[PDB]
Ligand binder design. Structure first.
Ligand code: HEM
Ligand code: HEM
Ligand SMILES: Cc1cc(N)nc(C[C@H]2CNC[C@H]2OCCNCc2ccccc2O)c1
Ligand SMILES: Cc1cc(N)nc(C[C@H]2CNC[C@H]2OCCNCc2ccccc2O)c1
Ligand SMILES: C[C@H](O)[C@H](O)[C@H]1CNc2nc(N)[nH]c(=O)c2N1
Ligand SMILES: C[C@H](O)[C@H](O)[C@H]1CNc2nc(N)[nH]c(=O)c2N1
Ligand SMILES: [Zn+2]
Lengths: 411, 407
């Protein structure tokens, strides 16, 4: 079968056949679309087909499908599964798999970059101190003094589900949030609960508006351990505005390295529960979401106040005005400090070129419109007008529950 | 089977039960989500009629009453005898209000129960259709104090006698492709404008020429009519701070009035059912003015603001966009023509959703359409999970008549 997608701005029509390799479910049915829902221990039995499908994909990619090396590797993995109940990826397969999870990540607008990913193999890691060291090296390598490089670090896979590696932080670098007795929040409200866990674990909180959180790391199903990332490794950007000299006095800054640490990488049926990965920011993630979401830093009011906008009626579009200026400030600040960042016009145009290339060479590019369209100025970006098909390919990145909810405390 | 939706800003969780009454299909499967696709007999009609009359009699608290059983029988007899049936005025009004209520792509549905329904089922000619439509236009406009309305022409019979309005909206601007290669007026209407002139329209060849109505009665060839200019309320566009704004010579019409859709009530199909409300500001300022394939005025505006257009990262498009949208709202508000901003409309829709969840067990909603085309995440709808499903009565898309009609 063939599915068609249309761009309503260009009338360019693309044909998808890759959706025929989709295995996992969407959450949608013929009767309900769950396209805007945010979140919609394996047997040998379920494991060998998944291994086989993956190795068939790996061997086709290298143009060795059905070769002796392909056949020997299937047999070898087969034997490893029956005997040990799991199996180990070759380094080449791990790299391919991690690149493909990114390539297949339908919520990611940055995927033009998928084939340039530095993979750090941390599968020999055994302790939380070992994890800390790996994660420092990743941060320093990725940061590269502002010339950011995409990277992923991959800790040992799940075994019985009792011995999981996890990074408890949702991202490697984030700011503490503190709920005050009066109900206000100091710092980042998204991180209150986690900040509270860190404090309970023994973290001494400076209690400011931009305190980089400690890493809380769990190796081999053990209780998690606290580490402070060396501050010389945490690149930050003070935020100022090119025309508005009072903007600096808002006291804003942000970190340069966006690094998701709570997701699960599935490759060939294997589950890598700790696999922090990082790229560089699109300006709107900070200027729109981190700064202006009402449940985050929520700076719209204070900015529009200082711009002397008419704030008595929403129809003055004061919020929209303050929003644009903040996003100008973020991009200006990162560029001035030579820290890599991409604006939403550039990122979306690049994504459209990526998606078109993928249709020609791959037969498709699964894409989640709800996530791909930027959270400001949607329709003046080319992605708004692009029809997309969302389906699930493996290798893949997946959500997993927060570890404080499932962890068996040892003491 | 019971489904939850969460608002990620407020943590409010709602439980949807209404989806289990979903009739039609979404286009999605368990393998593939088509959420962002624009367009994804006697025997058949009685189930549809019964489904509808059941929900109608339920709504007036008369479910299972003799009058309920009697109507079901009467309709049954009429279908077996005539191969269709006719709706009571009460059923027609309820059906039309419910098609709007069910419109998952509409942010304005808090209004759904205040719809003036004009019953035009006795209409027989295009001139009659023109009369009905001028009266709708005038009623709805109400000197700028806009009132929601729908006008319902006769239902489909054998499908060879369709009533259609060929216009996509009652009021739109002409589009003409030039020897220059560029486009004068609205590029969306080039083909429709080339159907008008071909049937004999006196095209003035300007940038903002209100198109003529092209009306088809009883499956006949369509005829041209000009809406009395004093019935087409238009707004010159100016900015409250930028004096030069007026010099772009921009204007828009006050009445948004979709005229190409099909109203389905109880299996009956109303192929000509123009309806209207009032604008949300972004429809004009973001979409009409700034789409690359529309009036596409961003470049001109950014220039008069003297912004740096050398690099996308100065956000010049974004800056101009906000100002263009400030101007649209200010102009409509100054000329006292009803308009809603995207902040107000989306806050009202959140209130509406909560009402529908509380009183009806859900509210079908298409997030892709409901989130405004600018400033998405600063409106509350951005953070609201929505379930999309199809309920009847409904408005549906239908083929453009020129591809279907035989002359
Ligand atoms: C290179 C620069 C990159 C840019 C500009 C970029 C951009 C983005 C943005 C804007 C999002 C949406 C995030 C949000 O709204 O919360 C996202 C999501 C995502 N990206 Fe990227 N990305 C980049 C690199 C990467 C890398 C290196 C990976 C992994 C190897 C990755 C995998 C993902 C995944 C799995 C998501 C979905 C996350 C979720 O559902 O929470 N991306 N990307
Ligand atoms: C009262 C003021 C109203 C407001 C502010 C409003 C708002 C909107 C908006 C912004 C859209 C998206 C349009 C687009 O982007 O193309 C829309 C779509 C729609 N509305 Fe409304 N609406 C109103 C009244 C009505 C009425 C009176 C009806 C029918 C009786 C209706 C039925 C629909 C339908 C069926 C769609 C989807 C049309 C399509 O798929 O192209 N709306 N609404
Ligand atoms: C590798 C990478 C690069 C990039 N530019 N952005 C990202 C995403 C990071 C930085 N900005 C937002 C953050 O993503 C956080 C995870 N996604 C949001 C999310 C997912 C599930 C549930 C709740 C959520 O808030 C990752
Ligand atoms: C009753 C009503 C009120 C309102 N405020 N807006 C509307 C929608 C009107 C005003 N702006 C766009 C117009 O709807 C056009 C049709 N919708 C978009 C569409 C659908 C299918 C195919 C192509 C399209 O462009 C209707
Ligand atoms: C309910 C809705 O799906 C949710 O708010 C989504 C919308 N789109 C998004 N898009 C991105 N990129 N990131 C997000 O967090 C969200 N949030
Ligand atoms: C391809 C995509 O579905 C298309 O551009 C949609 C997106 N969301 C929309 N939302 C609204 N309200 N109106 C539209 O015309 C569109 N167009
Ligand atoms: Zn879907």
């Amino acid at each position: 079968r063939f599915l068609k997608v249309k761009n309503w701005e260009t009338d360019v029509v693309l044909t998808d056949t890759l959706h025929l390799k989709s295995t996992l479910e969407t959450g949608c049915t013929e009767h309900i679309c769950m396209g805007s829902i945010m979140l919609p221990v394996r047997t040998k039995d379920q494991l060998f087909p998944l291994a086989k499908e993956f190795l068939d994909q790996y061997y086709s990619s290298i143009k060795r499908f059905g070769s002796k090396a392909h056949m020997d590797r299937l047999e070898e993995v087969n034997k490893e599964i029956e005997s040990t109940s799991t199996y180990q990826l070759k380094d080449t397969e791990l790299i391919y798999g991690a690149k493909h999870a990114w390539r297949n990540a339908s919520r990611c607008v940055g995927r033009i970059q998928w084939s340039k990913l530095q993979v750090f193999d941390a599968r020999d890691c055994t302790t939380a101190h070992g994890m800390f060291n790996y994660i420092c090296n990743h941060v320093k390598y990725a940061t590269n003094k502002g010339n950011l490089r995409s990277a992923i670090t991959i800790f040992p896979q799940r075994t019985d589900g009792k011995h999981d590696f996890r990074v408890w932080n949702s991202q490697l670098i984030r700011y503490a949030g503190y709920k005050q007795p009066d109900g206000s929040t100091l710092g980042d409200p998204a991180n209150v609960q986690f900040t509270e866990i860190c404090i309970q674990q023994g973290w001494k909180a400076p209690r400011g508006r931009f305190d980089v959180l400690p890493l809380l790391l769990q190796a081999n199903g053990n209780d998690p351990e606290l580490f402070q990332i060396p501050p010389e490794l945490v690149l930050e950007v003070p935020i100022r505005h090119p025309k508005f000299d009072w903007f600096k006095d808002l006291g804003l800054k942000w970190y340069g390295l966006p690094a998701v640490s709570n997701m699960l990488l599935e490759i060939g049926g294997l589950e890598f529960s700790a696999c922090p990965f990082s790229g560089w920011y699109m300006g709107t993630e900070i200027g729109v979401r981190d700064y202006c979401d009402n449940s985050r830093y929520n700076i719209l009011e204070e900015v529009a106040k200082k711009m002397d906008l008419d704030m008595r009626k929403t129809s003055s579009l004061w919020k929209d005005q303050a929003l644009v200026e903040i996003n100008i400030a973020v991009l200006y600040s990162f560029q001035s400090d030579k820290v890599t960042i991409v604006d939403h016009h550039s990122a979306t145009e690049s994504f459209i070129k990526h998606m078109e290339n993928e249709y020609r060479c791959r037969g498709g590019c699964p894409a989640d419109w709800v996530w791909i369209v930027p959270p400001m100025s949607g329709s003046i970006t080319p992605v708004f007008h692009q029809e997309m098909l969302n389906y699930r390919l493996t290798p893949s990145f997946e959500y997993q529950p927060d570890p404080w909810n499932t962890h068996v405390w040892k003491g």
